[PDB]
């Protein structure tokens, strides 16, 4: 008989809310990805996560090691007439301020459907207007 077994129905989640304002992205990404997968709790299999539900409200007020703001391109291949189009970090954080935090934790999380199940526990905003107060999210400063 098996010592312990991981079961995804048995895993329970509650709501949390974090600060992104003035935070260094190199620390925010590692702690947020570990939180989202439960890799700050007891662990077992990599095929079942032990995370929780997480809100980000001010997702573009972060600070970075990116010192030359006209570098990076964010290319995405769709196959339309062989084309690709570039955007800088300074223009990307203006078009999609809610996306930078997600592509930052994408480097700490597995690919495909197992990754997408964790990306449903993370929710993002940049207008800093709270909406889920009926769920009572737990406030975290670090």
């Amino acid at each position: 008989m098996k010592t312990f077994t991981a079961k995804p129905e048995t895993v329970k989640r509650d709501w949390y809310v974090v600060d992104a304002t003035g935070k260094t992205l190199g620390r925010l990404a590692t702690e947020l990805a570990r939180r989202l997968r439960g890799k700050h709790k007891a662990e077992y299999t990599p095929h079942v996560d032990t995370g929780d539900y997480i809100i980000v409200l001010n997702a573009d007020k972060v600070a970075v090691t990116g010192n030359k703001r006209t570098d990076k391109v964010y290319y995405h291949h769709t196959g339309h007439i062989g084309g690709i189009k570039q955007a800088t970090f300074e223009e990307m954080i203006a078009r999609r301020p809610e996306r930078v935090i997600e592509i930052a934790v994408k480097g700490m999380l597995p690919k495909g459907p197992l990754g997408r199940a964790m990306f449903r526990k993370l929710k993002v905003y940049a207008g800093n207007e709270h909406n889920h107060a009926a769920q009572q999210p737990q406030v975290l400063d670090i």
Partner: protein, 59 residues
Amino acid sequence: LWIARINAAARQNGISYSKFINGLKKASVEIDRKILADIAVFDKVAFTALVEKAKAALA
């Protein structure tokens, strides 16, 4: 999978799995083998007092 459950508790105590296992191997009849290592989730006050017993044999 037992390594993951032990390393998670070692990290939540400020010690590494490599040091935790090596300290419990430097003491006699203390390693107790991973097949009984449910003490990594049973109680953390006792796990902290096991990490300090391993530190008293490691160094």
